[PDB]
């Protein structure tokens, strides 16, 4: 289906360079103001060389800007358009302490994995899990995808999303308020 169908998403990543990718079922959506065809539905198998649906994605903030895609117990690492050699790997081999079948991830060098009501911090070692709702104020303990900007993170749940200020770690006050339509207020779909 197309970007503006209103259906929930499976994953997002901000490449931290002006471009980002959304994932839903078998489809990958490149979202960049520089794109000749922004939001053109392409097959994940065609762009990333793997079968959808994926569970989570993130892109590291460092120089190399590697993209990580998660599905089940496995992850794939990409750079410069291409799957790195020695991928896929088991999550346990790259991310000790992080569970399988995650719901979401984001990168600020701190990475956060989300699964049910809990999240895990990873630094390039893992800690005890904490509660999403305790540390991300106004975010319920159920997220489908996440992505990190410069001053905000976004949490996606069904057909709606939340924006959280990174300083306050609280959902921002806007009008109409969060949670609100991904299609209408985040993608700027008709």
Rounded CA separation 104/118 (Å):
11
119 binds, among Cl ion, Na ion, none (CB under 5 to 8 A by kind): none
Cβ–Cβ < 8 Å for 143, 135: no
Q: Can you say how many angstroms the Cα of residue 80 is from the centroid of all Cα atoms in its chain?
A: 19
Dihedral angle computed from the Cα positions of residues 9, 137, 153 and 163, in that order, rounded to the nearest 10 degrees: 70
- CB of 110 or CB of 177, closer to Na ion: 110
- CB of 104 or CB of 171, closer to Na ion: 104
> Whole-number minimum distance, CB 13 to Cl ion, in Å?
7
- CB of 6 or CB of 8, closer to Cl ion: 8
Segment 5 to 64, residues that bind Cl ion, using CB under 5 A: 11, 56-57
Beta strands per DSSP E along 133-179:
145-148, 152-157, 160-165
Decide if residue 145 touches Na ion (CB under 5 A).
Answer: yes
Question: Which residues contribute to the site for Cl ion (CB under 5 A)?
Answer: 11, 56-57, 104, 145-146
Instruction: Provide the binding-site residues for Na ion, judged by CB under 5 A.
Output: 10-13, 56-58, 104-106, 145-147
């Amino acid at each position: 289906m197309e970007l503006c169908s209103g259906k929930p998403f499976d994953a997002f990543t901000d490449l931290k360079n002006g471009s980002l990718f959304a994932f839903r079922g078998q489809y990958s959506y490149e979202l960049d103001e520089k794109a000749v065809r922004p939001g053109y539905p392409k097959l994940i198998r065609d762009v990333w060389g793997i079968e959808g649906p994926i569970d989570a994605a993130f892109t590291r903030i460092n120089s190399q800007g590697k993209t990580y895609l998660f599905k089940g117990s496995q992850y794939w690492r990409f750079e410069d358009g291409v799957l790195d050699p020695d991928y896929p790997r088991n999550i346990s081999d790259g991310f000790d302490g992080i569970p399988d079948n995650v719901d979401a991830a984001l990168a600020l060098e701190r990475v956060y994995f989300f699964k049910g009501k809990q999240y895990w911090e990873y630094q390039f070692g893992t800690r005890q899990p904490q509660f999403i709702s305790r540390d991300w104020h106004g975010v319920p303990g159920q997220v489908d995808a996440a992505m990190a900007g410069r001053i905000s993170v976004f949490f996606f749940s069904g057909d709606k999303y939340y924006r959280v200020n990174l300083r306050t770690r609280r959902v921002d006050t806007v009008d109409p308020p969060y949670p609100r339509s991904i299609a209408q207020y985040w993608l700027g779909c008709p």
